[PDB]
Design an enzyme around this catalytic site. Structure first.
Site, short mmCIF file in Angstrom:
data_model
loop_
_atom_site.label_atom_id
_atom_site.label_comp_id
_atom_site.label_asym_id
_atom_site.label_seq_id
_atom_site.Cartn_x
_atom_site.Cartn_y
_atom_site.Cartn_z
N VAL A 292 42.37 -12.62 -57.29
CA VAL A 292 42.70 -11.49 -57.63
C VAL A 292 41.67 -10.92 -58.68
O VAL A 292 41.30 -11.67 -59.74
CB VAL A 292 44.13 -11.05 -58.08
CG1 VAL A 292 45.08 -11.04 -56.92
CG2 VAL A 292 44.60 -12.37 -59.14
N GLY B 5 41.39 -5.03 -56.65
CA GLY B 5 41.27 -5.64 -55.49
C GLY B 5 41.40 -7.19 -55.40
O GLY B 5 41.67 -7.62 -56.44
N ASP C 78 25.41 -13.96 -48.33
CA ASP C 78 26.21 -13.31 -47.98
C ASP C 78 26.08 -11.76 -48.06
O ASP C 78 26.89 -11.10 -48.27
CB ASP C 78 27.64 -13.75 -48.82
CG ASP C 78 29.05 -13.21 -48.22
OD1 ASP C 78 28.92 -12.78 -46.92
OD2 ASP C 78 29.83 -12.90 -49.24
#
Ligand SMILES: Cc1ccc(-c2n[nH]cc2-c2ccnc3ccccc23)nc1
Ligand SMILES: [Cl-]
Length: 309
Positions: free
Chosen positions: A21, A15, A127
């Site tokens: 990355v 992902g 978050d």
């Protein structure tokens, strides 16, 4: 070379949505799998190093992976942590986009405990989303326990020595995930412990219902869409979100929305409140989770589930 940080052999990519990355990898001393994150060193928003420090600060916490290495190599900074399993969003999807009341209670108290540990280490998370809570790997001792990753949005909310809380302020940027973020976040208010817990309450209703009533809203701009979502949150009573569901989830949401800005949340009260749901329904808190029944009892499968992923 295929090996970074002396001991970690790079494997397949898994992902890239946050800053950089992410790859699988293996420790070439003991074979233990790791997750490796690469941040371009010539970046204007340096973030990986602060994340390593956050992981090191949380070392030893249940459900928080170890960070084994941070260093610079070539044009990248590199961080290496434990490799984990699918996210709760993945598992929710594979279970048909609904979790049973029992599974929601069980992941909820683990998520409350995780966020509590973050808070006890002077940080707010900011978050909250099901995508950042991951289970373990197949066959491991923590296979079906909930873990927390991605601390790029975390921030100190109190001085570590004196425990003096940060001041209230407004006109903050609307950074975060609109589906789950607290009402205060929509209004540009400085976030505190209560906002992490309100986002959790939104996630709980998302798991229970399959959707939140502020999904699918339309507006010409992301800014106007965020505002409509915040409007819907402010005008939807928790008992309406909770229609046909155990009312403890409404009581939780209303409670954490009522917390004073600098107040210490009663985490254990919240956990006991949600555990009483299982008493009402005659269920046991025994670790059995919905996703453990996927694929005939085998659990989630990489080509049936994770390939549609
Ligand atoms: C250094 C580092 C490495 C990865 C991550 C990460 N960010 N988001 C999810 C993961 C993540 C973490 C652990 N195992 C995973 C397994 C599959 C997919 C994602 C992950 N963060 C920091
Ligand atoms: Cl606009």
């Amino acid at each position: 070379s295929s090996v970074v940080g002396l001991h970690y052999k790079i494997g397949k990519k898994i992902g890239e949505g946050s800053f950089g990355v992410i790859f699988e990898g293996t420790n070439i001393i003991n074979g233990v799998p790791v997750a490796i994150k690469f941040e371009p060193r010539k970046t204007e928003a340096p973030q990986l190093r602060d994340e390593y420090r956050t992981y090191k600060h949380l070392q030893g916490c249940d459900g928080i992976p170890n960070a084994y290495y941070f260093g610079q190599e070539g044009l990248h900074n590199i961080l290496v942590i434990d490799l984990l399993g699918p996210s709760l969003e993945d598992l929710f999807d594979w279970c048909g986009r609904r979790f049973s009341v029992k599974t929601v209670v069980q992941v909820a108290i683990q998520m409350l405990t995780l966020v509590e540990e973050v808070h006890r280490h002077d940080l707010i998370y900011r978050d909250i989303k099901p995508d950042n809570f991951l289970i373990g790997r197949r066959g491991a001792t923590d296979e079906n326990n909930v873990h927390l990753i991605d601390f790029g949005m975390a921030k100190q909310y109190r001085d570590p020595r004196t425990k003096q809380h940060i001041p209230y302020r407004e006109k903050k940027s609307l950074s975060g995930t609109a589906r789950y973020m607290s009402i205060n976040t929509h209004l540009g208010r400085e976030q505190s412990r209560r906002d992490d817990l309100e986002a959790l309450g939104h996630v709980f209703f998302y798991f229970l219902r399959g959707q939140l009533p502020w999904q699918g809203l339309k507006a010409p701009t992301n800014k106007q869409k965020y505002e409509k979502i915040g409007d819907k949150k402010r005008t939807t009573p928790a008992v309406t979100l909770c229609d046909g569901l155990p009312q403890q989830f409404a009581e939780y949401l209303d409670s954490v929305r009522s917390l004073p800005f600098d107040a210490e949340p009663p985490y254990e009260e919240y956990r006991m409140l949600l555990l009483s749901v299982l008493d009402d329904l005659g269920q046991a808190c025994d670790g059995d989770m919905d996703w453990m029944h996927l694929n005939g009892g085998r659990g989630w499968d990489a080509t049936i589930n994770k390939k549609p992923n």
